[PDB]
Amino acid sequence: AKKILVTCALPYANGSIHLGHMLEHIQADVWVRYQRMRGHEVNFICADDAHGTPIMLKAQQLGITPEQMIGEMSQEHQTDFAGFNISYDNYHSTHSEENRQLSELIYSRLKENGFIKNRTISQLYDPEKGMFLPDRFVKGTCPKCKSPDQYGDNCEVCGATYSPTELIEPKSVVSGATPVMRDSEHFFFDLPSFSEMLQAWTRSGALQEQVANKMQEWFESGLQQWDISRDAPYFGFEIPNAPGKYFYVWLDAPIGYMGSFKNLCDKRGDSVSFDEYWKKDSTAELYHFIGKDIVYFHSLFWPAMLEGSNFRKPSNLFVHGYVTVNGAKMSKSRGTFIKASTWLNHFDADSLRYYYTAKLSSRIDDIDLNLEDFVQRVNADIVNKVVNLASRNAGFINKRFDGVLASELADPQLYKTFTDAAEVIGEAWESREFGKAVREIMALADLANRYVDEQAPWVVAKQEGRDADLQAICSMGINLFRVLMTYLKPVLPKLTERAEAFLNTELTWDGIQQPLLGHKVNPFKALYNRIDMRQVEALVEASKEEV
Ligand SMILES: CSCC[C@H](N)[PH](=O)O
Ligand SMILES: [Zn+2]
């Protein structure tokens, strides 16, 4: 059995989970559930990204400690993910003792190895509040068009871009005082030293083609040293031997992947697995599911950091595109900027899991949630192709044959056609070609419904002396359903539980090789109901009003 550690990017603690986040967590959860079905040792890990100036300032506005605020958001996040049944083995935080010790360890090792440099820089400073200001916390009049109240390095009127130092009449967004340039010593990570190593990895053919192409652009532009320190006031980890200096959030964030796993091991009383997974000589596999906006950190800084601190590097990076709703970026004003919590007030988790999965592929292309198509696809595929296979046959079995399935398969050849597809469908789940897996599964479902139509059980049911025939027909349809739900198990956790309760059996990948014969099934209430555009409209309206 393989030993696999899978992660999703760590959500920032200063915002609610939305449909963008869910695309990633659902993609990874489907892959993880499939890996568990094939018998491998899997560790699905995540955590909240809880450090940084934005977080520090928000807590100060709310009138509470950053600890309290991140504690509340952590609970909010986990509640939403649980509602979508994301099966984490552990959900921790970057603000923990495990991450502190690991961040300090890696830093000391990098420093000892000569990968840390000291350098003084100039930056805007709020003399009143007594803190350096990140670009987005500086505002004034645009140098070009002279438009007042512009933020950061760009103007929202003429679209011009510039250094905040070029702003006319600058003002601290925090205190309102006029900021001034001030010097400060910073610590840098020498990424350029790992150039050749990284180019080799890019060239190995492991990463996605589109990712490798993006990386060549970055090497062409040239790698630079990375500033990894921030001055107090700051909500984060203090740098050893450097009073008033802290690790920049992006330095400790990925280490959080390690901290969450150490936390899991420690809680389990397991004293050997952390090293078995992170040591240089590991035979375990490590995968990170991430979005295209953070590929630079994960494909360049991260592998380099690990190499320089004597740890293993990622086995692979699985990148996905952005989520769009009705073809465009989520829009607050149109009500398409949807929170995960809000979605669950209107629809169930399985519906979205299925829709995203049917559109996902191994490439980094954007995924579009077309609301009109969502209603049509869910009703057509889940309700009318798969669930229909059970509902149209279970009634006769429970009422005419006391819930007992036939002693033999009515059509052995057809059943073999279904089991024969396991190899290709499983390879589809394995390679992340989710769209192909769903197409193959639904094609089988069409085959199953065609079989039922050919047999016409509603006709056989009303013809004298054909009881045995009816039971055989309906049992055959139910077994085809058994197979289909097995292939879809990684996708629809809840519908799967309802199906296993009806079938009186847990669905395992290898189990399909033994059909249910002379087997008792239970009566069942609706396994899945239809949805409609009225519900979609309510979702959009609720989302409009929430912002
Ligand atoms: C180590 S992954 C960190 C990801 C950022 N918090 P954001 O959700 O891109
Ligand atoms: Zn302007």
Swiss-Prot record:
Zn(2+) binds at C142, C145, C155, C158. ATP binds at K332. The keyword Cell membrane does not apply. It catalyses: tRNA(Met) + L-methionine + ATP = L-methionyl-tRNA(Met) + AMP + diphosphate. GO terms for molecular function: ATP binding; methionine-tRNA ligase activity; protein homodimerization activity; tRNA binding; zinc ion binding. A motif ('HIGH' region) lies at residues 11-21. It is found in: Cytoplasm. Homodimer. This is Methionine--tRNA ligase. The lineage of its organism: Bacteria, Pseudomonadati, Pseudomonadota, Gammaproteobacteria, Enterobacterales. The chain holds residues 5 to 551 of 677 of the full protein.
